[PDB]
Amino acid sequence: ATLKEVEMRLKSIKNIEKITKTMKIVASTRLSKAEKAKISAKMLTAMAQGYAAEISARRNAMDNASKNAGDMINRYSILYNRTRQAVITNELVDIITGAS
Amino acid sequence: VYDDLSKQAVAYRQLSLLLRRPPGREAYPGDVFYLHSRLLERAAKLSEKEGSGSLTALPVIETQGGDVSAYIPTNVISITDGQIFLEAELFYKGIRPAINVGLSVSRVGSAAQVKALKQVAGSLKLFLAQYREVAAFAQFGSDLDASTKQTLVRGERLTQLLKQNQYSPLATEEQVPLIYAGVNGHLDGIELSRIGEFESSFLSYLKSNHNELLTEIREKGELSKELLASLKSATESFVATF
Amino acid sequence: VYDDLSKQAVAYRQLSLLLRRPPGREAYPGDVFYLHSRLLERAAKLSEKEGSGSLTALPVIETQGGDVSAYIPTNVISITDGQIFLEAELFYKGIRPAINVGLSVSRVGSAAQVKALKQVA
Amino acid sequence: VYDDLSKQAVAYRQLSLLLRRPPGREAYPGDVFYLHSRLLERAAKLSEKEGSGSLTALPVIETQGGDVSAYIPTNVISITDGQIFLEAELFYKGIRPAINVGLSVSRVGSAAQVKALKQVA
Amino acid sequence: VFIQELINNIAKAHGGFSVFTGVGERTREGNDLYREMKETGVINLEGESKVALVFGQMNEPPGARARVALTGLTIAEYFRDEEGQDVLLFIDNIFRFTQAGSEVSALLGRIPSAVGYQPTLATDMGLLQERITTTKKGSVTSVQAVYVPADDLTDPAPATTFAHLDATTVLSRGISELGIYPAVDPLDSKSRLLDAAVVGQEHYDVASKVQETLQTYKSLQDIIAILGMDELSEQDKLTVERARKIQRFLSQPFAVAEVFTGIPGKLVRLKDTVASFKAVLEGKYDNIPEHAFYMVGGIEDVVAKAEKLAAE
Amino acid sequence: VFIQELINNIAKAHGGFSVFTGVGERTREGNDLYREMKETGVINLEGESKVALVFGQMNEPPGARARVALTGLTIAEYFRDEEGQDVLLFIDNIFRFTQAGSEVSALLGRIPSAVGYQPTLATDMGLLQERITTTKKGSVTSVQAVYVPADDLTDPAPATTFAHLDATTVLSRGISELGIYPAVDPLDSKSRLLDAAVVGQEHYDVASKVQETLQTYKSLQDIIAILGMDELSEQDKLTVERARKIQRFLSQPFAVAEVFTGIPGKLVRLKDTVASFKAVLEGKYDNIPEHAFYMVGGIEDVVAKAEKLAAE
Amino acid sequence: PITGKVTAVIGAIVDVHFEQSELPAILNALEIKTPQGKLVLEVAQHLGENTVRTIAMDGTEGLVRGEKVLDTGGPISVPVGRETLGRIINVIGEPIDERGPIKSKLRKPIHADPPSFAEQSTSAEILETGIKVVDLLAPYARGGKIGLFGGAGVGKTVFIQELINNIAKAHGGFSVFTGVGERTREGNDLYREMKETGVINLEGESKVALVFGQMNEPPGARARVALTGLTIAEYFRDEEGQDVLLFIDNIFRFTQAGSEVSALLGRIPSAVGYQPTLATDMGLLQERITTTKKGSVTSVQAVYVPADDLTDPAPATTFAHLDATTVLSRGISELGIYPAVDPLDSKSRLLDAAVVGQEHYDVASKVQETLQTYKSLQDIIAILGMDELSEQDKLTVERARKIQRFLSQPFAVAEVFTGIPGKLVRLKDTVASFKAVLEGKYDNIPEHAFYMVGGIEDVVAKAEKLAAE
Numbered sequence A: 001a002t003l004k005e006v007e008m009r010l011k012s013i014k015n016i017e018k019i020t021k022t023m024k025i026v027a028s029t030r031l032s033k034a035e036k037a038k039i040s041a042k043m044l045t046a047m048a049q050g051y052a053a054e055i056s057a058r059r060n061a062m063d064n065a066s067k068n069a070g071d072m073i074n075r076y077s078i079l080y081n082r083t084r085q086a087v088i089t090n091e092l093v094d095i096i097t098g099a100s
Numbered sequence B: 001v002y003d004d005l006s007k008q009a010v011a012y013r014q015l016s017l018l019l020r021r022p023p024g025r026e027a028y029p030g031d032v033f034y035l036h037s038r039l040l041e042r043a044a045k046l047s048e049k050e051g052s053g054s055l056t057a058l059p060v061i062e063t064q065g066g067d068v069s070a071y072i073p074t075n076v077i078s079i080t081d082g083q084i085f086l087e088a089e090l091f092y093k094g095i096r097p098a099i100n101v102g103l104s105v106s107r108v109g110s111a112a113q114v115k116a117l118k119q120v121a122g123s124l125k126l127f128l129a130q131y132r133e134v135a136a137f138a139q140f141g142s143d144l145d146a147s148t149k150q151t152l153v154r155g156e157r158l159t160q161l162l163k164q165n166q167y168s169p170l171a172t173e174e175q176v177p178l179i180y181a182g183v184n185g186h187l188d189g190i191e192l193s194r195i196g197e198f199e200s201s202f203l204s205y206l207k208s209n210h211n212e213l214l215t216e217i218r219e220k221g222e223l224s225k226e227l228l229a230s231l232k233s234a235t236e237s238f239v240a241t242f
Numbered sequence C, D: 001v002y003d004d005l006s007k008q009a010v011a012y013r014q015l016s017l018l019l020r021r022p023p024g025r026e027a028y029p030g031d032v033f034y035l036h037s038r039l040l041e042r043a044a045k046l047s048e049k050e051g052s053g054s055l056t057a058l059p060v061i062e063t064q065g066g067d068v069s070a071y072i073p074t075n076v077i078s079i080t081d082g083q084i085f086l087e088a089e090l091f092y093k094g095i096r097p098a099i100n101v102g103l104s105v106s107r108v109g110s111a112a113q114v115k116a117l118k119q120v121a
Numbered sequence E, F: 001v002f003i004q005e006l007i008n009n010i011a012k013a014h015g016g017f018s019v020f021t022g023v024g025e026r027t028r029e030g031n032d033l034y035r036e037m038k039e040t041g042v043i044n045l046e047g048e049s050k051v052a053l054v055f056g057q058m059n060e061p062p063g064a065r066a067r068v069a070l071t072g073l074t075i076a077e078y079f080r081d082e083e084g085q086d087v088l089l090f091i092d093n094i095f096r097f098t099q100a101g102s103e104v105s106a107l108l109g110r111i112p113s114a115v116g117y118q119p120t121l122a123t124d125m126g127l128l129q130e131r132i133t134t135t136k137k138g139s140v141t142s143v144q145a146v147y148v149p150a151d152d153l154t155d156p157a158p159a160t161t162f163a164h165l166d167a168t169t170v171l172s173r174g175i176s177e178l179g180i181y182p183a184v185d186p187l188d189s190k191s192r193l194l195d196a197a198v199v200g201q202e203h204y205d206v207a208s209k210v211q212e213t214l215q216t217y218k219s220l221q222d223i224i225a226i227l228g229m230d231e232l233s234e235q236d237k238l239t240v241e242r243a244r245k246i247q248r249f250l251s252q253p254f255a256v257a258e259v260f261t262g263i264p265g266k267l268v269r270l271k272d273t274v275a276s277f278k279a280v281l282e283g284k285y286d287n288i289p290e291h292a293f294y295m296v297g298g299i300e301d302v303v304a305k306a307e308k309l310a311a312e
Numbered sequence G: 001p002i003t004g005k006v007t008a009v010i011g012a013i014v015d016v017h018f019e020q021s022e023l024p025a026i027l028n029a030l031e032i033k034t035p036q037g038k039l040v041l042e043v044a045q046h047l048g049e050n051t052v053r054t055i056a057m058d059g060t061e062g063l064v065r066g067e068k069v070l071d072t073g074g075p076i077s078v079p080v081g082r083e084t085l086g087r088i089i090n091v092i093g094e095p096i097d098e099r100g101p102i103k104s105k106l107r108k109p110i111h112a113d114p115p116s117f118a119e120q121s122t123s124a125e126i127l128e129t130g131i132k133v134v135d136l137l138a139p140y141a142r143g144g145k146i147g148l149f150g151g152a153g154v155g156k157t158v159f160i161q162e163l164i165n166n167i168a169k170a171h172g173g174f175s176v177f178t179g180v181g182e183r184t185r186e187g188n189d190l191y192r193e194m195k196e197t198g199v200i201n202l203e204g205e206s207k208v209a210l211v212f213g214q215m216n217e218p219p220g221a222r223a224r225v226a227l228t229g230l231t232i233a234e235y236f237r238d239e240e241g242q243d244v245l246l247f248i249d250n251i252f253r254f255t256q257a258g259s260e261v262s263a264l265l266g267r268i269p270s271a272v273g274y275q276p277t278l279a280t281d282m283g284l285l286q287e288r289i290t291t292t293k294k295g296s297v298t299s300v301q302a303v304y305v306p307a308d309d310l311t312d313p314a315p316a317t318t319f320a321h322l323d324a325t326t327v328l329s330r331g332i333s334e335l336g337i338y339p340a341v342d343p344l345d346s347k348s349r350l351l352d353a354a355v356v357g358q359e360h361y362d363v364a365s366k367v368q369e370t371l372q373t374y375k376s377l378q379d380i381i382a383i384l385g386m387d388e389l390s391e392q393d394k395l396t397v398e399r400a401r402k403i404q405r406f407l408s409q410p411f412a413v414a415e416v417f418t419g420i421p422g423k424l425v426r427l428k429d430t431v432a433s434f435k436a437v438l439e440g441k442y443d444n445i446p447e448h449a450f451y452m453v454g455g456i457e458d459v460v461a462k463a464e465k466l467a468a469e
């Protein structure tokens, strides 16, 4: 991959990881609201449990997604560094071979 | 102002290659760092023994594709005391003059900042840093916490205050009342589109009605506690009218 | 038909290195463009005063991973009055000849299409 | 035990570039493989005609960022008869000697294992 | 195609002499231009002609391609200084002047620079490109096509050329593959004249709001890709829809494009353009489908096309 | 290990002679091959032998490692032309020939190509690789291992070799790290003979549907990595489950490598393979756990293993 | 004397012809009398035809061909001993503080061999720094190399000044500070700070000698200033028998200057532009820093990482030499914990029970486990709230915050602006204090009795005074 491709990919994964962490926080506030409704309803009790369950599942899924994105950001940071170094050295070898 | 040191480095590369000096990392000669450090270290502030004069330098660099890790950018970043980063993304979001406040940093000028401005900007930098962390909540602003909602309100009003028209620099007497109003939160109730009209209206209110306040800010260079009370009253009165 | 101009460009890169001429972009010699352009400009339609004859060229280029942005592909695209682009996804999906109808364009042959086929198409 | 062959490769890169030898991949000289293989081929087990003697070698390599795909690692992996890979994650989790059991393999020494260990493992 | 549209729109209305220099373009594109200019009466072999043609096409040796631009400049400069005229100079592939300099460079004996370009690249180009200026004796308006050798605008020839121009119109492959023609990238195409002192505040504000809308839509691309537009807020959904309308509305059929588009070419006045985009930014047409905005000659055409799709 | 499995399966079934050339590989691997050839009986020291061995291993100077392939090829060509025999020529690590060409070239003082390789890399490879053809006098099959430095398939020597080969098998480190041996990448490996006129329409259909399934899985794999499989559609979930079963089923225990796998070696007939994978594509076995597909010798073994797992 | 004419001048590279046919050895210093001062050339190559090639320690503007050069008969040689203390020296050993000549009895050549293998110390030893977080969690190696990490504003200069002060007080050994390609502004600010702190004392006794090479200096000077500083520290080790400190304000600038010198000589660049000699240049600098029979030189070195890429060849080559790492980081200062050492990212190779002893290793391990567990929960305990955890985990959190505050310390150099009297805390007292805190013996005392305090006896006294308050 060219350096700009892996840089843009890495930037996108960092953006996604922030997005999913915020969606996790928003899901936690919605989970507090859902817990309030669930207790107050304890068919309405069915939707209050189903809503609290959906909001909790979304919080859990967004936590998993943020952890996965963090690991992928680590992998792409390492590949970015290796591509940067390889590019610098290959261009400098090309300059030297042109100067010879 | 060296309005492009990259084109000097390119000219010196032309000279070096035509003089057949050995090329380096981007065919720039090995001493292109010595060239820019020999140029830039001449900017200095002298002691009273030497007449206390000073030379300030502002070098300019054109990062190709935003690559701050190109060779000449890396050298001049390492030689300079601080960096102001401008971005096309910010420019096209209408943040002009487009300064990336997250990356831009001044190692030394924070000791030189005008005291009246430093008193207000200390809050401003924290509110902006919080806004930059919470900004991703702006896409999903339903069911926010009140803290993140208030962080978006301040952050948006402050960002919309920091934009400025070309060739219209403001005196510090004109800058500190506006940032004071923004950071304290008098603009939190104002529609974000209006904030720009607020700037010219509030200055006009201060200049005609409170010219003694702006004069005292300019002459003393610092906001006394009396002056902070006076500025609070004037700001609240204007917002009540606004 | 030149069933690979890219292999000519490789042979000319080799010959240039043996002549100890320094490489340029993608390590091809700088005049690798001039090599193909002075070749392909020889395909022409002559005027009636010149006897109406014609030479038509179909250069072939191998892309790597479909990358039409690569140096030799974009060089030849900048010479050839258009291209037929053949897509691996269509070919391995069994749509053969696999001509991508979006990326293929003839810049001048629409004036030369058979009229009945233009009318129906 | 060659306690760092990576540092021998670095010293040979220095010597070759000061000789103005053309740099190759990662600016190592092209014969850096020949440097290590003509070394590591000297470790051998001889026949009973040759007196049954043997020389065993343990080369050692540092991988920057754990990249076993780097040039010198892949060169020496392609010379040796297996590798013991020590994982930094395990070592900092206090699993020491930190042998990664998946990525390590002995490609010829399984015939030389103690049979009692072969039975119980 | 963009240069030929500019020639059609301006070079016949310009009311002053013109020069066209082909520098390493196709000999066929020159023969087609000559036929067009001869039939549209810009060239009259039995009369007076208003354009001079200079060609050093890609069949020519690098020495010729490195010098034909100077011939074009010298004729345009004679019209500017000696006749005192207002002169319109077109150069097709001025990049080919720089590339030919690289082709000779190694044979001259120069050490190649960053990616094999001649060391003198910036000063050879600056010596050429500073002659094209307007002066107190007369004006030159100059339009130059710049090739980009792997679509990378960071290549030293494009990157150096950007410093020399009052207006830059970056065309991009991706936008053209979306079928948006003329494929101008609304961002990273820029002009010195986009000042409220020059265009007026209404134009400046409309163009600014357009660019903020398009940059917002470009920002949302990551979440629309991975999480889909259903994740957006109502204000973001509105902004994305309006951005996609604006993005198609910037497309336009040219007359030469009539061969490739099948649609008769249309000219849109500057006032009509500003009014149309202002009205679109006001949300006046948020109910109209996006395809009514594609390949149309202003907002009257948008409304007529929307009526045509509704009748269909 | 792949070459040694091919030698065991093919080389004694092949009717004519064989030649093995070891170029720049381990002297240990050569001694182990010579012992295995004597034990299997392809070499008889007191009888007739079917194989000739040529070695110039990685202990040899670059000149020897460069030329030894030409000695092996000259013996193979003599069997093809003079004897008229069908030959199969094995070349363990032909990249070591190319790399040796670079090493001597560095001492010759030529200006290098690419990452320091010699000029004449392409013509060097052509002159070696063109002699290996079959002719009207006799067939020559050849199987050539090609080391890929730093796993970089863009490296000039692999990229040069790909042009010359009728079939290419690409072995991926990532696939081998998943424990999928023999580590063949199912999508990057390709053959001239994968043609319905050659394999028959049933085989071509099964192979095409396998390839489309695995390409779909590869397209999902980063969405799956971020979000897990739960975000997929039911059609995607089914396609991914079947793609996982299919790629897991492409693993196979080789007889030469049972020391590393414990499972005894399997040969699977071509007809049995095509019937097995077509039956998998029909979804007939979608209820079977993926582990039953892993490392087994065809679908009857998948059913037997699934029964063993269900009883356990 | 041996003398020779200048024959070529090409930037910082000068060729000199010695028609006497007694050429100066490689690395010899030659000197030219310029109209102002003198210009020093270091010999880098012998070209043949009696011609040597040399790299210039100062600007070459104004040189003429046929200009006259003297061979000084050895490498660059610099004044050594007590006279260096409190004075600023350039690469060639001239004073640049304008306080006149150094008038030392000795000059020593900056190029010298490392101690022989028989001379090396056979076992590692701890240099007690007097800094609790260092002496406990990343003990400094006596005669070792220590890397110092972090941005600006983390307090590096006050930490370095406290290291100078503490080693002068506890061990009697002097310090040398060498600034390599430093900003002349920051070198001036450092000299002013060092006079305010009083580690430099122009009328009295100074505890540190200063060496500076500026970004405006040619690359040969910036490459050699580290060897000048090292040679002064070596003289204090070899002939005063001290345990000396050597500070290197950036070792990356040393690498970069060596790369520029190599490029100007016309050597083919290597892994990513650095000189092919990168590893041997670093090894020749670093492994002179060692313990011997007479004493030790311990070195603290500031490791800039060119792109945060710890895998970059200049970091990767430097890291091979470091015996310990101290990370200063912004976050620890944001909690108000000065000296803002990161207690978990700082590490030492010498934190092993054989070198430290089992008691120290156990205390440090328990501290590291406690802080790492507290940091791991700290997000989820904020999500759930402090009561939403096991009472055992809540107790470990109480310990973790109490220990984390206890790692703050009052520096005596800080006292000029912080006002609180600085305290130097011995290693044994640090180990005992943290053992007692880990034993829970002070679980009742409030955590603010542990802030900015000099050991557990002082924690008790502060708790008593604050309770009386």
Ligand SMILES: CCC[C@H](O)[C@@H](C)C(=O)NC/C=C\C[C@@H](C)[C@@H](O)[C@H](C)[C@@H]1C/C=C\C[C@H](C)[C@H](O)Cc2cc(OC)cc(O)c2C(=O)O1
Pocket: D068, D083, D085, D101, D102, D103, D104, D105, F173, F176, F177, F178, F179, F180, F181, F260, F261, F262, F263, F295
């Ligand atoms: C530094 C370079 C690294 C380089 O990338 C690597 C290829 C290399 O250089 N050397 C390792 C080469 C062989 C070692 C294998 C024989 C075997 O020892 C291990 C454990 C592998 C590890 C892989 C997956 C585990 C999984 C549970 C599997 O399913 C386990 C497994 C089960 C099985 O059933 C009989 C058969 C198998 O072969 C495997 C298997 O492959 O595991």
Ligand SMILES: Nc1ncnc2c1ncn2[C@@H]1O[C@H](COP(=O)(O)OP(=O)(O)OP(=O)(O)O)[C@@H](O)[C@H]1O
Pocket: C077, C078, C079, C105, C106, C107, E001, E002, E147, E181, E182, E253, E254, E257, E260, E261
């Ligand atoms: N405005 C347009 N409308 C419709 N089609 C267009 C337009 N511009 C370009 N095209 C399509 O793109 C093709 C190439 O256009 P054109 O010859 O102007 O490109 P170019 O940038 O000059 O290319 P080259 O580098 O080959 O000279 C045209 O034949 C037409 O198919």
Ligand SMILES: Nc1ncnc2c1ncn2[C@@H]1O[C@H](COP(=O)(O)OP(=O)(O)OP(=O)(O)O)[C@@H](O)[C@H]1O
Pocket: D077, D078, D079, D105, D107, F001, F002, F025, F147, F181, F182, F252, F253, F254, F257, F258, F260, F261
């Ligand atoms: N089909 C297979 N079954 C079992 N194990 C295998 C298989 N293929 C490879 N391996 C294992 O992977 C490694 C393969 O080593 P091998 O000598 O075949 O590799 P290579 O590609 O020839 O390497 P080199 O570059 O060192 O010449 C050994 O550990 C072998 O145990």
